[PDB]
Amino acid sequence: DKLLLANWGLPKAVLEKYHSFGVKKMFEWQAECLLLGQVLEGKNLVYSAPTSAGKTLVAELLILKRVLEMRKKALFILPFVSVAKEKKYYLQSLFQEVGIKVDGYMGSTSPSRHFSSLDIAVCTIERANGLINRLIEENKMDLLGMVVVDELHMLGDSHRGYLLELLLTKICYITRKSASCQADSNAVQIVGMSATLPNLELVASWLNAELYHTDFRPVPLLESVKVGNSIYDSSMKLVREFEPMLQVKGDEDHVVSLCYETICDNHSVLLFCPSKKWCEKLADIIAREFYNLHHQASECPPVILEQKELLEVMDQLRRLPSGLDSVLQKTVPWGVAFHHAGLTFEERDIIEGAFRQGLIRVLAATSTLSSGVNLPARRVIIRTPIFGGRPLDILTYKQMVGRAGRKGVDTVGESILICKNSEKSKGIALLQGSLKPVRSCLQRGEEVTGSMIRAILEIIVGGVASTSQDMHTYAACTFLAASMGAIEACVMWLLENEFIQSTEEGKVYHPTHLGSATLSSSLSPADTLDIFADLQRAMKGFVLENDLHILYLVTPMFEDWTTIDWYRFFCLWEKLPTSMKRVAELVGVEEGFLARCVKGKVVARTERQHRQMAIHKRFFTSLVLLDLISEVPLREINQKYGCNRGQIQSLQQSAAVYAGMITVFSNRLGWHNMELLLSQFQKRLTFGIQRELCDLVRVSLLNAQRARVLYASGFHTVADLARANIVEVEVILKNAVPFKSARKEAVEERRNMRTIWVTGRKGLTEREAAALIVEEARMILQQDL
Numbered sequence: 001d002k003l004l005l006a007n008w009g010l011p012k013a014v015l016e017k018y019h020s021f022g023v024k025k026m027f028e029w030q031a032e033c034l035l036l037g038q039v040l041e042g043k044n045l046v047y048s049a050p051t052s053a054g055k056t057l058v059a060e061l062l063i064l065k066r067v068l069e070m071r072k073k074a075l076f077i078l079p080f081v082s083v084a085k086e087k088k089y090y091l092q093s094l095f096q097e098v099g100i101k102v103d104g105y106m107g108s109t110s111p112s113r114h115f116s117s118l119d120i121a122v123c124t125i126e127r128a129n130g131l132i133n134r135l136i137e138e139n140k141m142d143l144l145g146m147v148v149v150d151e152l153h154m155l156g157d158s159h160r161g162y163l164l165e166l167l168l169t170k171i172c173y174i175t176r177k178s179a180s181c182q183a184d185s186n187a188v189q190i191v192g193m194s195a196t197l198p199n200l201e202l203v204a205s206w207l208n209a210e211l212y213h214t215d216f217r218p219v220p221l222l223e224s225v226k227v228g229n230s231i232y233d234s235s236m237k238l239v240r241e242f243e244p245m246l247q248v249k250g251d252e253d254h255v256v257s258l259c260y261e262t263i264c265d266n267h268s269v270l271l272f273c274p275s276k277k278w279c280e281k282l283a284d285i286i287a288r289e290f291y292n293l294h295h296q297a298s299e300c301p302p303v304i305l306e307q308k309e310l311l312e313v314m315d316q317l318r319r320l321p322s323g324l325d326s327v328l329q330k331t332v333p334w335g336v337a338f339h340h341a342g343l344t345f346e347e348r349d350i351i352e353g354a355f356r357q358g359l360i361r362v363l364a365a366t367s368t369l370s371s372g373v374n375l376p377a378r379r380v381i382i383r384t385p386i387f388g389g390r391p392l393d394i395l396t397y398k399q400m401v402g403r404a405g406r407k408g409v410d411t412v413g414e415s416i417l418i419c420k421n422s423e424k425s426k427g428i429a430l431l432q433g434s435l436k437p438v439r440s441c442l443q444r445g446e447e448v449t450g451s452m453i454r455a456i457l458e459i460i461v462g463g464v465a466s467t468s469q470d471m472h473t474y475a476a477c478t479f480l481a482a483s484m485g486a487i488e489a490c491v492m493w494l495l496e497n498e499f500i501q502s503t504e505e506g507k508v509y510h511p512t513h514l515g516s517a518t519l520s521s522s523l524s525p526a527d528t529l530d531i532f533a534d535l536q537r538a539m540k541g542f543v544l545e546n547d548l549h550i551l552y553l554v555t556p557m558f559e560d561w562t563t564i565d566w567y568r569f570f571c572l573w574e575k576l577p578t579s580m581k582r583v584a585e586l587v588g589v590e591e592g593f594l595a596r597c598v599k600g601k602v603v604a605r606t607e608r609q610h611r612q613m614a615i616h617k618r619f620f621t622s623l624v625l626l627d628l629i630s631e632v633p634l635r636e637i638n639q640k641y642g643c644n645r646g647q648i649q650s651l652q653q654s655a656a657v658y659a660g661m662i663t664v665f666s667n668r669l670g671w672h673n674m675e676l677l678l679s680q681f682q683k684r685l686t687f688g689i690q691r692e693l694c695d696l697v698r699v700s701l702l703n704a705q706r707a708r709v710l711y712a713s714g715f716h717t718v719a720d721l722a723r724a725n726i727v728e729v730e731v732i733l734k735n736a737v738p739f740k741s742a743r744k745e746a747v748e749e750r751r752n753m754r755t756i757w758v759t760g761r762k763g764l765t766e767r768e769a770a771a772l773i774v775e776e777a778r779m780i781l782q783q784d785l
């Protein structure tokens, strides 16, 4: 009818891309969300819908609208780097045919093309907030046409979610300062979306946006809870008396039986488990039982139509900086796998693709995946309502059970929450539970608050708020004031700590050098005080014989990245060379405190002055980072310190970004000598390499491992690599592969095996990759001239 996608004036290049797989007609709620109101005119919109209902199409049609009609640039903001990268490639594939340049601002990644020569920028929260501030410093704010926010419910409380408010308030503040222009239409449109929030109307009013809400969902979700053999619904009514056709020993809350039942019916199952260790243990059991039950009585997958793709998955894992996991090597041949934060992001990209293609039918995951990328399944099983020793959060629950039901595939989506008689009441609480109202995170015996101090600093230093009148005008645009002193307290704080200047033109506020430095560094004003002192302390007495002391200055300690074994730490302390003990003493690492940690598990940290704990945690971390840029194997670092490869990769990408911040901060203060030393560690922390490999790693396909083996074989630079014979590069790459046996038959059937993974990847052969490396090296060599 009228909701036919071809009747919406869709460009042919995009219309076919939509018709490429499904997407011929729209939903009832999608048509009402666009037409009703002035949404297509330029009015802001805040809409909510259940997961897997088609929230993406609404935004896509609006973005494609403004970009092509108004010829302005769009901003897409996503919570995590993984979902941001996924969204980039998904939007690129649709719009590359219409000459629409789409790049991304994610974590440490930087766009090759300037923002001025783009159309759609995909960002995380941190990078988006920074880009906005960049446009303010350059006054090129007129470029921005609209901002799209995914998961608008992260506005309440998160590690970086509060920045979403400061970002939006900043947009609402600038457009209000332009409302006093008295002219004589569209400006900057804000499209926000989330899950069903109780105070969603409050959010739409704050942004002066039209509201929309629906409960529509193409596949019905059957939320249930299992106690023993019986399965009940949300009203405690029995919906199924489960009886295992076959039975095995073990814990067995019919967990294997439920999964086996699902696979036999040609479906797939997601199994959520509390700890990282349970996922691997359970994935091993299920795969083992799947072998016994099928034949009625760590190898290769059976010869089927999917044998090649199963082998490619196992081979791609092997040729990764992580190698092929021992448990995965056993389970994956039988469509079983696990998924947690312990794996590297590259391993998880493989498994999700495997599960999405049907190669993996059973996936035992953690709560990390529930908030990650889009990955649906027929049945979702939650092993227990007790996660991490604490009862499961309501938001986590709705994110898990929301992945039950594949649109266009399954008739229903089933959700089972396994409980006992004791925790029976807590399970029902989750099924009937609903999301809590979104807090402002700028709430006030705390007249001053971090989020506010940062918010006030950004508008003054940026030069969009000078007087005292501008400050309270900004206070009106906040989400905190939307629900209907503290502002004045934050301004004085910025004055007391040399962040801002006051010139009595009565009462006008200007940025200091320390102010302008903090803004350019994307640093929090609360953290900047200790960082500024730490740097001044380091410049009074600095160790240069090793790279440890420099690394300490760029070692992040705002969050715990692992659980440190203190006994292990003290063992490394004694074996620690004298040159590195000097750095420890010079920082604050006292041997006495290390002894009181191993002897007694007293965390203390109740006193604020107990940043003494953070110091030892920070020095422990710098040691890990030291070995990391010394090209020490991940397995050695794992055994030496007691942390998995997942925690390490999350740390280095965090330290790579942080290292860049401290470098900028030092540059804006005129500290050249300090800047000079730090400016080489951002690149080394990223790839985990030494100075020699810095030139090789410019090539996209070359990481730490591939760069070293090519260096040790005669290829030291890109220039040397452009002259390279392709088949020689291929051979050197083949030598870098990790095998359990001391490897490094003739199989000429593996000449087409795609065993090398990339980002936004087609499977690459070891030959094709080598030719790409030499081809890219030549293109770079020419751009170097």
Ligand SMILES: Nc1ncnc2c1ncn2[C@@H]1O[C@H](COP(=O)(O)OP(=O)(O)NP(=O)(O)O)[C@@H](O)[C@H]1O
Pocket (backbone or CB within 6 Å): 022, 023, 024, 025, 026, 027, 030, 050, 051, 052, 053, 054, 055, 056, 057, 374, 407, 408
């Ligand atoms: N208008 C539509 N027409 C046909 N199929 C659609 C439409 N919208 C979504 N889909 C299907 O849903 C799939 C993707 O899931 P989607 O509906 O986009 O979930 P979402 O709500 O946008 N994301 P999220 O809830 O955050 O996980 C698409 O690939 C389609 O198969």
Ligand SMILES: [K+]
Pocket (backbone or CB within 6 Å): 697, 698, 699, 700, 701, 702, 703
């Ligand atoms: K690279």
Ligand SMILES: [Mg+2]
Pocket (backbone or CB within 6 Å): 055, 056, 150, 151, 193
């Ligand atoms: Mg969405």
